[PDB]
Amino acid sequence: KVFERCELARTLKRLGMDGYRGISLANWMCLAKWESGYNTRATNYNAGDRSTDYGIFQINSRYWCNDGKTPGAVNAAHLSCSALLQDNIADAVAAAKRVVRDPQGIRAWVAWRNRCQNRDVRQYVQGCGV
Q: 45 forms bridges with which residues in the sheet?
């Protein structure tokens, strides 16, 4: 499913993402926008290390979810990567929360540093009623 901007914003708020570990809703919106374009079925294979990024937040199979075919993998979140391709983003949100519980925080995603950090991200939630 491809979410509309405000629809996603409200959903993330309801799920308790606003200010989670110091991360504003506008930042989670900026991350989803650049990682998947707000698309829950987005998948990206990394030929270099044989891992795959799954879902709206492009969560990596080496440390956060299990897909069985990723070398030297771990499952911190303990989820099947299949759960991150659902239309219901409850599991993807639970996984994203786990990722930021680590010292890097939101910085775990390089895409966040390139296009979100130190920028005006208000545009991502403006007019949504959150």
A: 52
d(CA 24, CA 61) in angstroms, rounded, equals 25
Residue 66 maps to which CATH number?
1.10.530.10
List residues with catalytic annotation: 35, 53
Solved how?
X-ray
Helix axis angle, 5-14 to 25-36, nearest 10°: 130
Closest Cα partner for 51 from 74, 75, 69?
69
d(CA 29, CA 19): 12
Residue type, 7: E
Strand partners, 66: 80
First to last CA, the chain: 22
Distance of alpha carbon 60 from alpha carbon 81, whole angstroms = 9
* φ and ψ at residue 52, rounded to 5 degrees: -130, 140
CB 99 within 8 A of CB 59: yes
Burial class (CB in 10 A: 0-12, 13-18, 19+), 6: middle
Domain that holds residue 129: 1-130
- In sequence order, what are the beta bridge partners of 53? 44, 60
